[PDB]
Amino acid sequence: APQQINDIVHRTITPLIEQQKIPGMAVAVIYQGKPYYFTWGYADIAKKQPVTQQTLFELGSVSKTFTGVLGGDAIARGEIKLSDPTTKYWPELTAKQWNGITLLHLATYTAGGLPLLVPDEVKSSSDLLRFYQNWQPAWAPGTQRLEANSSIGLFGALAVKPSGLSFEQAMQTRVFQPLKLNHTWINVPPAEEKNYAWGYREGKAVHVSPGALDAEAYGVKSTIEDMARWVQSNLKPLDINEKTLQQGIQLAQSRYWQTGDMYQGLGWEMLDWPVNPDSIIIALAARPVKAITPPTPAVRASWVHKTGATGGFGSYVAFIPEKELGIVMLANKNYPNPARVDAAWQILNALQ
Ligand SMILES: *C(=O)[C@@H](NC(=O)[C@H](N)c1ccccc1)[C@H]1CCC(Cl)C(C(=O)O)=N1
């Protein structure tokens, strides 16, 4: 890779790994549309298996970007509408607080305080209906943003209802396959286990535990090769051949709500570029949102990003459409979000 990209990447990631005690890490920088990879340490400390470009890391909430886009694809197909009420696709949702809660609300965490996690005790399809039917909104729809897996996960599940496919088959055939993400999975196949890194939490190797709506909110595992093309796919969607998917990517980067200097998209979050670190550098943060009416089309001078975690993994994706610049950081250690965002910034700002 060009020496500048190489020195910045190393001058930056090295102390990051040393400071955060990161077992293994993969990084991709997309410069003027071409991927450049870097990898350090172990996927499995015990078996001395190193991190390589084909290692699968858990993405955590970064999975939400895939769901936003799958959702955006279903819209472009005319199968769902963001202005539709949630009950249109889950008629059994008769509790009266749902009147007024739309798919847009679910997708953007503005439904009224849906919880950050679907409680662990929710295991069956009846357990889930119960949980949603009994949930008590803290606020009116469209008034505050509370980042939640249970909000965006339901959106993902309902978004694919008209299609007729499982959320997984809709994701595989409508996002993964067209984009040639051949090593990205919701459930890792036995054939691919040899590449599944272990995550680390307190020195113990862990893998994400199953739970309700996990596929739709934090379930996807992937390699930095596939993540790099994912960044590439979102940077220049005009390049994409399948139509509804191209409109889909475009819709996930639309600006629906504004909170501070941040704009909420479908999965992806955006800020105006150029931007300052602290504008982008706490287990719950309820914040008021002003609706963007109508939603602003995807803005090229944005710092489009997404953070994500699991008990054992820390992920981060960030890209600037108008500069053809992007970065992906995959660690098998859930370290602090500010530290990730500073490394990204430190690297991308040094590239223009
Ligand atoms: C997305 O990354 C969120 N975390 C998760 O999805 C975890 N995998 C999870 C899922 C179900 C139960 C427990 C944990 C968000 C929101 C929750 C937290 Cl604490 C978090 C973080 O910054 O470590 N990220």
How many other C-beta atoms lie within 10 A of the C-beta of residue 240? 18
User: Considering only CA atoms, which residue is closest to atom 11 of ligand 1?
Assistant: 117
| Pair 135, 90: CB distance under 8 Å | no
The answer to whether residue 83 is catalytic is no
The active-site residue out of 61, 63, 254, 302 is 61
185 CA to middle of ligand 1, Å? 19
**What count of Cα atoms within 13 Å lies in the side-chain half-sphere of residue 350?**
18
- Token pair 């088959």: residue: 169
Q: How far apart are the first and last CA of the chain?
A: 17
Among protein residues, the one with the nearest Cα to ligand 1's atom 10 is 117
C-alpha count within 13 angstroms, C-beta hemisphere, residue 261: 14
Question: Hey, where are the domains in the chain?
Answer: 1-352
Half-sphere exposure of 130 (CA within 13 A, CB side): 9
Nearest CA, atom 21, ligand 1: 309
For β-strands 262-264 and 255-259, DSSP reports them as antiparallel
Stated resolution in angstroms: 2.3
The residue with tokens 């003027």 is 32
Cis peptide before 141 (omega within 30 of 0): no
Which is the closest atom of ligand 1 to the Cα of 337?
A: 22
Q: Which residues contact 18 (CB under 8 A, 6 or more apart)?
A: none
Q: What are phi and psi of 49, to 5 degrees?
A: -85, 125
Residue 221's DSSP bridge partners are 58, 185
- Counting ligand 1 atoms within 8 A of each CB, the residue from 58, 61, 121, 208 with the most, and so the one to mutate, is 61
The fold of the 1-352 domain, in CATH, is Beta-lactamase (3.40.710)
Residues with CB under 6 A from ligand 1: 60-61, 116-117, 149, 211, 217-218, 283, 308-310, 334
306 forms beta bridges with 317
> What CA–CA distance (Å, rounded) separates 44 from 64?
26
Backbone angles phi, psi at 163, to 5 degrees: -45, -50
Q: What is the token pair recorded at 106?
A: 């679910």
**CA of 255: how far to CAs of 107, 129, 258, in Å?**
12, 30, 8
Q: How was this structure determined?
A: X-ray
Task: State the Cα–Cα distance between residues 337 and 331, nearest whole angstrom.
Answer: 12
